[PDB]
Every structure is written in structure tokens, then in C-alpha cells.
Write an enzyme that holds these catalytic residues in place. Structure first.
Site, PDB file in Angstrom:
ATOM      1  N   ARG B  87      77.571 -16.021  78.891  1.00 12.21           N
ATOM      2  CA  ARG B  87      76.188 -16.389  79.166  1.00 12.21           C
ATOM      3  C   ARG B  87      75.622 -15.327  80.098  1.00 12.21           C
ATOM      4  NH1 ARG B  87      71.492 -16.613  79.318  1.00 12.21           N
ATOM      5  NH2 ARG B  87      70.206 -18.342  80.090  1.00 12.21           N
ATOM      6  N   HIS B  90      71.572 -13.707  84.573  1.00 14.99           N
ATOM      7  CA  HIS B  90      70.235 -14.256  84.589  1.00 14.99           C
ATOM      8  C   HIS B  90      69.929 -14.974  85.890  1.00 14.99           C
ATOM      9  CE1 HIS B  90      72.402 -17.954  83.211  1.00 14.99           C
ATOM     10  NE2 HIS B  90      71.428 -18.574  83.863  1.00 14.99           N
ATOM     11  N   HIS B  92      66.763 -17.997  87.598  1.00 11.39           N
ATOM     12  CA  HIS B  92      65.613 -18.865  87.384  1.00 11.39           C
ATOM     13  C   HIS B  92      65.104 -19.455  88.706  1.00 11.39           C
ATOM     14  CE1 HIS B  92      69.248 -21.232  87.081  1.00 11.39           C
ATOM     15  NE2 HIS B  92      69.475 -20.756  85.875  1.00 11.39           N
ATOM     16  N   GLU B  96      70.678 -24.810  90.073  1.00 11.10           N
ATOM     17  CA  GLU B  96      71.526 -25.223  88.979  1.00 11.10           C
ATOM     18  C   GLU B  96      72.804 -25.855  89.497  1.00 11.10           C
ATOM     19  OE1 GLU B  96      72.096 -22.293  86.015  1.00 11.10           O
ATOM     20  OE2 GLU B  96      74.220 -22.681  85.768  1.00 11.10           O
ATOM     21  N   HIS B 135      73.220 -15.024  88.356  1.00 11.44           N
ATOM     22  CA  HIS B 135      74.532 -15.516  88.018  1.00 11.44           C
ATOM     23  C   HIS B 135      74.853 -15.324  86.528  1.00 11.44           C
ATOM     24  CE1 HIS B 135      71.632 -18.881  87.785  1.00 11.44           C
ATOM     25  NE2 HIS B 135      72.338 -19.270  86.736  1.00 11.44           N
ATOM     26  N   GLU B 157      66.211 -23.750  79.043  1.00 12.00           N
ATOM     27  CA  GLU B 157      67.232 -22.677  78.997  1.00 12.00           C
ATOM     28  C   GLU B 157      66.742 -21.456  78.225  1.00 12.00           C
ATOM     29  OE1 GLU B 157      69.970 -23.055  80.925  1.00 12.00           O
ATOM     30  OE2 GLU B 157      71.008 -21.175  80.441  1.00 12.00           O
TER      31      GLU B 157
HETATM   32 MN   LIG Z   1      71.568 -20.504  84.994  1.00 10.14          MN
END
Ligand SMILES: [Mn+2]
Ligand SMILES: [Mn+2]
Ligand SMILES: [Mn+2]
Ligand SMILES: [Mn+2]
Ligand SMILES: [Mn+2]
Ligand SMILES: [Mn+2]
Ligand SMILES: [Mn+2]
Ligand SMILES: [Mn+2]
Ligand SMILES: [Mn+2]
Ligand SMILES: [Mn+2]
Lengths: 377, 377, 377, 377, 377
Positions: B87, B90, B92, B96, B135, B157
Site C-alpha cells: 500500500r 501516502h 491524509h 488512522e 506512512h 481511501e
Molecule cells: Mn493511510
């Protein structure tokens, strides 16, 4: 078997505890088309995922903005009445539209000039009660099960204004003054709402008709949708009722669509407003195209509510072996659609070709006539 | 068999086409307790009723405010990664929180002082990434499947800020100036996001640890929840992680609850904020008591999200033959509950008796000690 | 010459009447980078495009949410005072932060314990007045011109609470009772606000200091920003003042950034909140990266306000031949940034390589130390 | 020279770095009339202060509520097409109104009954496309540059629903079923939007006209505004198009106003709704009177958008040596104004005198006939 | 005597300092009917509880959404003018409806075609000024006192657009250019609003009538309500003016209701919109039935504003020894009511009996004719 969210070299098996029955119902959500993209609001909800209010005489359950938040302007109730049972005399702010799926019922309504309309409604018939006008439903010998649609998404069937509730919360001395009777003559009024209650079957409709000094209502509050001539195309049928034909139905326009196995409601959009859907029977998928490269595919079957926000592109494909039957509902005074096929057929062929990078072999198949439901070759 | 919405002399058979599989999943919604009353918002949604984004390396699906509108403050993603799959790096706006249901993964995070934290996370472990800190996740040899929770219900997401997306939308001459390299040296940068991508398994964690001039992070971003001593009561176990023990977890407080067959999460409420729930395994019902005589019962099973608005009374009953395992999540710096039993146990017995119209035989059973999960006798 | 919106084989000449002077100021808007994409809110506004309120003693003009709607939390006033001129004793709901661009001024503030603070402020100095605490500004012999920032975007300088306005709208008998004087003794009170008014230069600061029975204020309301040691990097300097150093400045964090010709504020974001910008001198461009493949480039020069919503990626490039000097303002108790370079430097090199499809020749240039302003090679 | 914000004994020189070019464009903002007062929202924005989207075939830039937040109901796009270039077949929720400033173009539209309208539009002509009806633009041999107005301020030209985008996000098997063709026959469909693309000049309009079985559209979607007889007054001309003359234009009413040097659009207001303005050529000032003693003056020139909220008093004065040409746009089914002069002329003279403290020498000049544009003596 | 909040064995004496005069005015609030239940918004406010704006020539006070927040769509002003006094020429966004309670006044209005209407209004007459059309009021020899109603609840009489205020905030050079006069000829214009001002009584109406080239207005802006034939029932009279009879009154529908001692406005609701009430004289109580078992009773007397949200059940009972006179106002193009009595009279008697658990002795009293005001026996 056990479906997995795998499409070619994308996706993986599910490794956590899961809901296999729901996954089997939603094959195009567990494994969407590769052409889907981006975040789109949920456009799907099942009446089976709602609390059912059970009463002596029937039940009612509802899909509102609290369940399906994209649908801010329209809400719906699935209501069932046993033979003779009565949905109590009541009114509300919202206009109400109905489709009789099973059985039959007698409705009453009295308008603001004191004119009454009483009629029987069978399978495939509609009613529409304008905002604020009081009404009742009483199932006949088969009982009745029907879909109601209200023109505010915040509606609840638990918050209607009911006759006995009004009286139970009015001083007895005021009720007595209102009618010119004594308090003792109204001592047996109910202390709370009835809502739905069992009752003996009524007599024949003709014996119930009430005459009055204010005349007949100018327009009827019921409509025999399935007695109309449908638009017939190769894969199915569309019956439209809006304010141009069902004259009183000013805020709700409707179509009942039947799609044969192997057929689909063609690629189209609505240029006027949002579509709210109810799936009466069968199994479908629909892709909603939301602009800016966004699209999301949903599955539906009997008991599901769907939605298509204003002007979004869509189709409804039958993905089962039985007929697919659903309603298209709009908060508007008319039904309107734009067919992708018809749109392109009505443009110069080389202009269409310049857009699609396809040749005459494609533009030759386009039809200037709109066929709402098409059949696979 | 075929369930029907009938409770004694209330309700009726379903006469229209219906979803029997959903009805079987929702026995307490098709036939609610007679003690339910009034309009309550939907408090239940299944991940199986969402679109699954499939990529080379895994998948992701989400339950947000667009699916479950009561949950305005919290949203969640069920994400799956194949062995080695990444993943993408990224960030945001939202904080989280995560629970590792299956497998294991390596995470990275670098804070605003340039301090890095890299760690492996196994089944029953958590992470928490503060708002805005960048992360990554990379599954190890088993792959990984986990639940993410974000502290805004409007999250998607599909809208995170990703490393390669940022660079693909920055002028090449600026990237080149930023790093002191030529445009030619960065000509192979990806032209679009990766999001999730396949990759070789990493080496041992110890070989990845990056030293730097800014020191170690003051608090770890992972937590071994199932290695803690749980609150143990007769019918199950509760493991709590909030900011008092998992120090970095400032905006999310959590409990993993296990309820044995025949047991229930007792009657309680939370005096601080709304509860968001995820059902890892088993089958439950919960009644949410919403004041003013309002209550509604919901069913849940593996893959379902639930919710209890701030201070509403509730219990969670195991209604199956396997353990019921779920998470209680709160957007707050601590976990708090008020137990009905403990509350009453701590009051004068005749005062409780005066309220309940019950005698000493009832107040004698009350316990001054809180037992979050009780077992039926 | 006459610029045209043409980039290679894209765009065309402007054929309608146009604003060539603005087009020359906005070369990266008339001809954006090809890497820009999608709809992004306007992030740029000029004080020259506002109404200037002229008074005897100076002027004031403002950029608020009514001019720049993305900036809902922060608004700003450019205020000018002639020598000796006074900005009338006043208060407001909002906290106020200030940067002295030109000249010098004396400020007063009295806190809620009746403790007074009076101080002189020169070029490069700040003040901060907590919400609701009353204050004044009086320019010294050079006059003064300064930038004010308020922590609500809906603020207007025309709506402060002013001493004389308060009194002009209080019954004279109440004012007289309040102070123990007669109505005749206060008959000369002004009938309306002063707002800004000419006045003789004050004496030396030391002669104005007012002693009182309530002690000294615990923390000063001014700060000498340019007397601090800046973060120095190859292309410029950054001076940070937030609540960790300028102790009273609880709701505003700030940095003054100087970028030499050929240098740039590096690729970074802020993990805490939105950035509001004021361009003191020079010429810049900035690309704001808004996720989901969205990015838009803006030009700025002296007198412009800019903005970067929370966590959006950005850089600020000097595109002129003089130093670029601007402020970064945040409604928060601290300044924080994440450097793209430092982030990647602190990760395993092969992990970064796997993301960027670049090799060791790229990861070898990364720096574990943060250099906020970098210089082109 | 170098303007300064000084008016008599009010204001002062600018002491900080400044934007002199903007200051010269805004003389009545740097130095407002002394009759201005109070906080008024910004009513002015330049297309030159927006990002220009450049494509092969032209460009587009937009002023929306994100740029000019007072304009919540109307947004606008300045679009340019090279010879033959096509604005891709598309639709949107909003109704669209257009004014052809430069060149000429062919438009198509197909309505919800499958009736098509194809027409050429030259300088001074309009179009109007009702909400949701699909359309295209193709520039002819001169190219084309035009102003579009949409009846929602939240619109973006980047979010229209486009033909190729729809198809690129529909499963190929569904497209194939929709049209009765194979997947192989549509394999060359574009994988993404075109938006604007170069193309060969079309043939003569008469050869493009498409016949169909559904008849001619009842009302044309274009209008020749400059071929109408204008209201002619001493200082200029006004050409009005609203739903009373341009029958399809139900949600947009419009006027093109020409004001000679030395003339002004007289003191008036609109009793129906907000005015949105576009300045085609020349230089203006306008004072907006907002009630309660509030007024603010703005400057405008070619490329600027302006606004006057519902019923606010205003005038538009030519302050240059060339004709001033602008549009007045309203989201309504008609154009309406109230002239200050005509209003007072139609009242008893002594009643007007009692209000204004002026005599017969003033009321003698009033005119009972409305002259929208007056010339200075 | 001293009333106490005691009803049988419920309630108690008031033990704290209290407002006995208000308690005596509100007997049904201090001691509500036992049939009241639940939380209902306040539906009652007195003009005596508002600030009265006093001017040379009269006064004005207002009840708006800031006083009575349930009334979001309608606000009201009680305005008084001395003989000859003028309410200054003005306009506003809102439509205005008026009822002349005392005295008489001359009104002017000029429409958007420059047609003027000037008329005298006496006791029991109405006016209606469409949105945005400018108007004036001048009391005649008796003075005048009247109730104004505006079709936005956010209105304030202090924020109208006034002739002299407009001019005082327009540059003198612009006013001079507008009218073709010199600045010197308009030097005596007022520097601020007049609002209300004393003036000599006007001459006869016939001498004020202004002829013009644009013709007569198509519909008059005044209406003689009390000259119409009322609906007469046993306990009182109802005079209705809506857009069907008072043609210009498009957004306000109205009824003046007179209820004799011992009579009541019957149990009814309105199926179209909210009711706003003004109590001209007498004393009343009303119960508002809000559905879901909610009801609350309010007291009213002269000077009070009341409200009934859309479709809520209600009655208005005279509880005093003088006639009760009030207005029912609606933001709609028509007046509509549903009578409880008439509704039930128009249904089959055994169906009504099944609802109410009452017999033929009750249904025999129902009337098919609507009697809006009934008298106690
Ligand atoms: Mn995330
Ligand atoms: Mn109903
Ligand atoms: Mn459809
Ligand atoms: Mn809980
Ligand atoms: Mn201040
Ligand atoms: Mn920054
Ligand atoms: Mn368009
Ligand atoms: Mn105008
Ligand atoms: Mn008025
Ligand atoms: Mn009423």
C-alpha cells in the site's frame, strides 16, 4: 461455490470472516467491472435490512434518508394489510404515491373543499394523495401489499398525523364544543393512536360512495397503470404515469419497467431530476456514471431500493432467468429521458464517427426511434 | 424454513417478492422485540454491500457516511494485501487506526521531525498514525487483511495523498530543482498513482531499521493489544487500547470484545461519545435505546459495521453457537462506560426499589464490580 | 510582448478583449504546467483588488472569506498609520496576530486581571493579542504599515468594538453612574467612532509604562522575530514563531520565509492545518497538489494573499531576480512540516526505489536533514 | 505616475511593496468615493486571475463560486476553439447560456423527444441549452471565442458528462448489448475523454441538418440578439433577451449594454433577482448600494466578472475613452428594472420635494420615460 | 388572586420569585391541559416584548425569526404614523402585505414598467407590494397604525433600501450625471436616511393621481377586505384574501377571523403551508397538535404573534368576554383548510365509528358543510 474478489491478476481471496450470502447477491460489487472508477455514494438498500413495525392487521417498514442518504427528496414504505385491516385515517406534509403489488384495497380521501373520493385499487394500480389531504387504506378480501413513495426523504410512517392521536391530545371540552356534543358522549374516544387495526371487510364500493353538497372531485386520485398501452420494445415494456396522464400526480412521475431475460433498460439519463428505484422482482445490475471518469456498479434484486442522481448515465441489465420488474420514480411533474442511441442517431454520422473513432459500420446501427428496453442478439 | 414477520397476533406473511437470505440474517428486524418503538436511524451496514476496489496486490472496500449516515465522525476500510504487496506511501488529513485481523505487515511512518518508525504487525496488533503523517503498509509472507478506521466519516481511501501521484502532478523542473538532479535522471517516474502494487517480500525487520540524526520517535505507533491482560468476566473478555496505554492513539479509543455463546456485553452506555462497531466474527443482536421511549433492535454478523450514538443505552447479545468478536471504537482520548448493574449497585437499595417497583430480592443481585460481559444462567 | 495561452500544440491566441497586465503577472495561470489537472479552488487574491478605507491618519484594506472563500478560518488587514496616528482603542472576538513590515508603533493591551502591557514594535517584530483583550496601535515618527491576521475568516476591521462607539451608544446617565461623575462632566464625549485619527507623537516608551496593583503580565504580547536565529539552508532562511517560543501566540503559528533568486521553498506539506500566505516582496509560483490527481499552479507577488488547504502538497519557487519574502500562517499552537526529501531519506532505499522506478543514483541524493529552502544547481 | 491612496486629508502613501499595475486598474478602490461606507462582499473577479485549461483545439477558464463567492447561483466559462475544433458532445445538470464574442460556431442539441436542432452562431448571437439536454460546439473557419453562463455557481467545466467518458466507463459487453454490435466492433472506442479536440472544418449547415421521425423542435435554441431593435437612449443601447422573446431561455435573462464615452447606465435596481455581469470591452466603475448606509465602489474592465445582489442600487459609469460593453445576466424568466429617475417622475412633485429637500427646479428634470443609458451634459 | 401550577394532584406552588402578571395572561401554560404532551417549539411572542423604534412622526417594532425562530418564512412589523407623517420612499427584497388596524393612509407604488398606483387605505383594508417594487406610506388626518407582514422571517425594517440613503451613498458627480443637473443643484440632498418624518397632510387623493405614458397598472395594490361578504357561521366570521381575489397578492394569503364570546375557530389544519397569526383583539387559547402524540397549548391576546407549522392540527378558542379578532397568514398563492368535522362527515358513518369507538349518535352530528367558527351550546 464460494465467490472471491478476483478479476484476472487483480484482487485476492477473502481471508477474514465474511458474509457469503451477501457476496453471492452482489457479484458485481465483490468483483466490479474494470470500467468502474472512483468514489460514488451508495445507491442501494434493502427493505430486508430494516426494522419491520408489526401491528394487529399488518406491518410497515421504511427506507428513508436515514438508510440511504443520497435520497434526500424521496422516501418509501412497504406496507402490508390483512383482509379488512385499516391504515388509520391520517395526513402528512408529504405527497404520497403508491403502487399496489399484491391484492387490493379501498382508499378514501377528502379534499380542502370537502369533496370525497372513495375507490378500490387492484394489482398494478396507483394512487396519489396531494400534500396534506387526509386519507385511509383498507384491504379487501385478499389483503394488500403495496409500495408507498413520499416526496421528502426525511419522512417516517411513524410520524403521520392520525385522527385518533389528534383527538387523544385535544382537551375533551374542546372536542365537545367543536361538535356540539357533551364530554360524556365522547368518553369512549381512544386514548392513543390505532395506526393499523383489524376490521371486518367492507361492503361493495358502490354502497360506500358518499354524496355531498360540494360536488365531485375534479380529478381522480387513482390510476390503472397496467391497463394503459405500454411503450413496447424488443426486450420489454414501459408504462409511464406522470402529471400529463395521471393528472393529480403533480410531484411524482413514475414508470413501471419490465425487462425480459437477456434484455436491458438501455443506456440513458434523465434531464430533469434524480431517479429513485424499487425492484419488484428479478435480479439486475446497473452502472451509474457520475462524470469526471467516475462510475460504480450496483446489484439489485426484489426488495431493493436504488437511486440515480440527476443526469447521471445508466442502464439496468437483467442478470437473471426471470423477468426483471422495477419502478423508476421522479420528484417532478413529468417523466423525461435521453436515449444514448437516439441522441447519436440524430446527429451527422461523420460527427459521431469523429467522436467515437468508429466508422459507418457503427453509425449504421443507430436508431432514430427510442427503444427503452433492448434485447441482446 | 421461510421466516415471516409475525409476532403472536401482530404482523402477517410477506405477499410480495422478497429477500429471504437477508430476512434469515435479520430475525430481530423482520420480527423485532415488542419493546422496540419509534423511528431510529439505521445503525447497521455490511462491507459485502460495498464496491470492492481490486488491484494487482489486493483490494479495498469502505463503509463511510455515504453508506451509513449516522456515522459522521468515523469511516472504515477493509483492506487486503497479498504477500509482499505494498500500500503505496501516502498521507491524509485523518488520523488512522488499524486492527490486524489476518496475517502480518510491515509499516513505516516518518514524523514531522524526520524521525522514522518501522515495525511488523501481527494478528491482534494495532497501529495508529496521527493526522497528516506519511506512512506505508507492506504485507509479509502470509499476506494481510485488516480493518482501518479514520476519524472523519467523509473519508475515502480513493482520495489519499500518494507519493507518486504528487510527483506525477509536479513540474519535472521543480522536482529536479527540489532534489538537485536533472530532468533526465527522473524521466522514469511513474505517470500516475500505484496505490496497491505487487512486490517481493522484504527482508528481516532489523535490516530495514533506518538510523538518523533526529533520534527515535518518543512513542511507538503500534500496540500489541492481545498481549495485554484483558478484563475477564464470566461470559468473555475485553481488551482496551486508548491514549492512556497506547500513548499515540489520541483520537481513537478502542476495545476488542469477545462474547462466548450464551453470554452478552451487558447493559451499558458511553458517557463520552458515539460508538462505532465492527463485527469480526459471530452473530449478534443489539437494542439501541434512544430516549423518549425510542428503541430499535439490529442484527449483526461478520463483516458488519454498527453504531451507537453518544450515550444511547445498549447491550450486545451473542445469538449464535460460536464466539462473538467485535470492536468498539470511539473518537476520543479515552474509553469510558457506565454499567447499568454497577450504577444501581452503588445506590441505596430502597431508592432503587422505589424506582423499579421491585424488592430486596432484586437489589440483592446487583454487583458493585463492573463485569462488561455476563453469562446466562 | 503579448503573452498567449499556448503550450506547444495546445491552446490558442486570445481573440477577445483582455487584461494583458494581469496576464503578464500570471504566466503560470495563462499557461499552466502540463502537470496541472482538475478543478481546484482559487488560492490567490490581491489586496490591490480591495476597497481601501481612507481616514485622517491612515488606511485599512482587507482580504476575508468574502474575497477568498477557501480561507474560512483566517482573514487579514493591511493597515497604514501616519506618524503619531492612532488606531482607536478596541477589541474583538478574534485573536489578532501582526507583522510590522514598515516603520514602528506603540501598542497597548490590558488583560482580564487589569495588568497592562505597553511596548514599541519595529520592522520584523510581531504582536499577538488574545481574543477579546482590548488594545491600541499608535505609529511613531516613521509612521507604520503592517499586516494583521485574525483567526476567523469572517472578520471585518469595520466591525471591531471601539471605545468611543460603545460610549456613544450607552445612556449618558449610565456612563455617569459607572464612573461617579455628572452628565455635564461627560458632555464632550464623541458622538461616533474615531477608528483612526491623527495625533501628536507620543513621548519615550519608558514614560508611558503604567504601574498597577495587579502586577506584570506573565508573558509579553510582542516578539522580535528577525532577532532570532533562523533555519538557514542553501537558498534562504526561515524564522518560526509559534506558541512554543512566542508563548502568548496560542492560535497562530507563523514563519517568515526568504527565498533567494534561483531558490525554492522545498516540496512539503503541513500535517496540522491550512496555510495562509502573505507575499511581502518578490514573485513566486506554487503548485498545490490536492490529491486524486488534482493540482493547480498559482502566481503570486507583493500584496497577494495565498492559501494551501490542510495537508496539500506544495512548493514555493522564486521566479524573479529579487529575494522572495513571504509569510506562512497557521491557526494552530505550533508550526509543523513534512519534507518530501527528508521523508524519503528516512526510508529504506530499495523501498523508495520500488515506488519511484528510480535507482540508487536517485536515493543517494536524499538528505536526512530538513532544508526548507533549496537552491538550484 | 504612481497613484497613492490619498483623498484630501485622508489616507497616506503606500510604504510596503505593492502592485502598481493593479492599483492603476482600480483607481476607485485605492481611492474610493467618500460616499462609500461599510463592509460589502467582493463583487469583482478577473478571468486573467484563473487557470487556463489548454487543449489541442483551444482553451477554457472559469469564474465560479470558488473564485467569487457572492455568486452562488451563476458561474461562467470563457471558452476558445480553433477552426474546426470540437467541444465534445456532453451534458450537465445546469442550463447553459452563451454569447458569441468572436467568430462563429455550429451547435447541436437533441431534446428528450429525439428532435434535433443544428445551427450556426455568429458574433452577437446567443444560445441556450436547457438543463440536461446534450449538446456540442464546433468552431467554423474563423475559430470562436464565447462566454458561457451556467445557472449554478458551483458548476465546473471539468465536470460535464461527456460521451466518450461515459462509454470508457461502461462495460464493453453492455455497450455491445446496447447497440446490438460485438465487442470487437467497438474495440477502438477511446479510453478517456476528448473534451476539446482538433477536427476538419464541417461542410455547409444545410448538409448537416438531420431529419427524423419526431419532428422539428418547437422553439429554436439560438437567438440573434444584435439583429433586434435595441432600447436606444442618449448615451447608448440595450438589447434584452429573456424568456418572453428568446422563448427557450427559461432560467436566464440577459441584456447587452453599450455605454458611449461620457455616458452611464443610469441609477437603477432589479426587483427580481441578482445581477451577474461580464465586461466585454472598455472600463467602468459601479457603486453597489447595499442598504443600511452601506455602499462600495468597484472598477471593471475587459475580462472582469461583476455582481449585484438582488435589489441593490447601482449604476455603471464608463470611465474610459472607448465604448463600454457589458452583459447583465439574471437567473430568472424575465428581465426587469426600476429606474430611479422614472420612479420619482411618476410621483407627486411636492412628495418628492419633501423627501429630497430640493425644489421644482429638480423635479422639473425628471422623465416619465425610462432611459437606461444617459449621457453627461 | 395568585394562580398556581397545580392540576388536581399534579404540580405544586411556585416557591421562587415569579412573574405573576405573565402567569395570569398564560393560564393554559402555567396549567396546561392534561392532553398536552412532549416538546413543541415556542409558537407565541408579544410585540410588547420588543424594542420600539421611535421617530419624529411615529414608531415601528418587529417580530422576526430572531424573536420567534419557528417562523423562518414570515416576519412582521407594527408601525404607527402620526397625521401627515411619511414612511420614506423605499424598497426591499421581500414582498409586503398589510392590514390597516387604525386610521388611514395614502400609499404609492411604481412598478417596473413605470406605472404608478396611488390610493387611500382605511380600517380593514389591505395592501400588497410585490418584491422589489418601491413604495411609500403617508398617514392621513387620523394618523395610522397597521400590521405589516414580510415573506422572509429574516427581514428587519431597519434594513430597507431608502431613497435618501441611496443618494447619500452615491457620488454627487454620479447623481448629477444621472439627472443632467449640476452638483450645486443637488447640494441640499440629505446626508442620511429620513425613515419616518413629520409632514403636512396631503391634499385629496384625486389631485395626487399621476398620469403617465405607460398606462394604468393591470391590478390594484390595495383591497377592501371588510367590504367583502364573509363566510358566516354560528360563532363568527371569516374574510379571506388570497391571489384568487386580491390578484396581486401572490405570496401571501390571509384571513381575518372574528370569534364571538363562547365560540371557537373549529378543529382544522392547513394542507398547504405554515400559519402565522396576529391577535388584533381579545383573548384566546390554541392547542397545536404536532403528530407522534405531541401537543402544546398556548395563550394569546392583543399584540401577540402566533404560529402553526405546516399541517399541524389546531383550533382557536375565545376565552374572554369580548370578540376575539385575529389574522391567519400564509406564504402561498391561496388559502386552504381541512375541517375535521367536514372530513369525517364525508366518510361512511360505520368507517368513522370503527375509528372513534363511538356510535351513530356521534356521526349523526357531523356536517358536510364547513363552518370555520362554531358556537358552544
Ligand atoms: Mn493511510
Ligand atoms: Mn399516508
Ligand atoms: Mn433511468
Ligand atoms: Mn458499548
Ligand atoms: Mn485589533
Ligand atoms: Mn507550506
Ligand atoms: Mn455545455
Ligand atoms: Mn443592473
Ligand atoms: Mn415596505
Ligand atoms: Mn388555522
Amino acid at each position: 461455490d464460494i465467490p472471491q474478489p478476483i478479476r484476472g491478476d487483480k484482487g485476492a481471496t477473502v481471508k477474514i470472516p465474511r458474509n457469503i450470502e451477501r457476496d453471492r447477491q452482489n457479484p458485481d460489487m465483490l468483483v466490479p467491472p474494470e470500467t468502474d472508477h472512483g468514489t460514488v455514494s451508495n445507491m442501494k438498500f434493502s427493505f430486508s435490512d430494516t426494522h419491520n413495525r408489526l401491528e394487529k392487521g399488518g406491518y410497515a417498514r421504511e427506507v428513508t434518508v436515514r438508510e440511504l442518504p443520497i435520497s434526500e427528496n424521496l422516501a418509501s414504505v412497504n406496507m402490508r394489510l390483512k383482509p379488512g385491516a385499516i391504515r388509520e385515517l391520517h395526513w402528512h406534509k408529504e405527497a404520497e404515491w403508491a403502487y399496489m403489488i399484491y391484492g387490493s384495497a379501498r382508499v378514501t380521501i377528502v379534499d380542502e373543499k370537502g369533496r370525497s373520493f372513495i375507490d378500490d385499487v387492484g394489482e398494478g394500480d396507483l394512487w396519489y394523495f396531494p400534500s396534506g389531504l387526509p386519507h385511509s387504506i383498507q384491504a379487501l378480501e385478499e389483503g394488500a401489499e403495496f409500495l408507498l413513495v413520499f416526496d421528502d426523504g426525511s419522512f417516517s410512517e411513524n410520524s403521520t398525523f392520525q385522527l385518533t392521536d389528534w383527538l387523544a391530545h385535544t382537551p375533551k371540552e374542546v372536542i365537545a364544543a367543536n361538535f356540539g356534543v357533551t364530554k360524556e358522549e365522547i368518553s369512549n374516544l381512544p386514548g392513543k393512536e390505532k395506526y393499523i387495526f383489524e376490521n371486518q371487510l367492507p361492503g361493495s364500493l358502490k354502497d360506500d360512495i358518499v354524496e355531498g353538497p360540494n360536488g365531485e372531485v375534479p380529478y381522480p386520485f387513482t390510476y390503472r397503470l397496467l391497463e394503459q398501452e405500454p411503450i413496447e420494445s424488443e426486450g420489454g415494456k414501459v408504462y409511464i404515469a406522470d402529471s400529463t396522464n395521471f393528472k393529480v400526480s403533480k410531484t411524482i412521475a413514475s414508470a413501471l419497467v419490465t425487462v425480459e431475460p437477456g434484455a436491458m433498460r438501455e443506456l440513458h439519463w434523465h434531464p430533469n431530476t434524480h431517479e429513485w428505484q424499487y425492484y419488484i422482482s428479478g435480479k439486475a445490475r446497473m452502472t451509474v456514471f457520475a462524470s469526471d471518469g467516475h462510475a460504480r456498479t450496483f446489484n439489485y434484486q426484489a426488495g431493493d431500493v436504488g437511486y440515480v442522481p440527476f443526469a447521471m448515465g445508466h442502464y439496468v441489465e437483467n442478470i437473471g432467468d426471470e423477468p426483471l420488474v422495477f419502478l423508476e420514480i421522479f420528484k417532478d411533474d413529468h417523466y423525461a429521458d435521453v436515449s444514448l442511441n437516439q441522441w447519436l442517431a440524430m446527429l451527422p454520422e461523420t460527427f459521431v464517427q469523429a467522436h467515437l473513432d468508429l466508422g459507418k459500420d457503427f453509425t449504421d446501427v443507430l436508431s432514430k426511434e427510442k427503444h427503452p428496453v433492448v434485447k441482446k442478439k
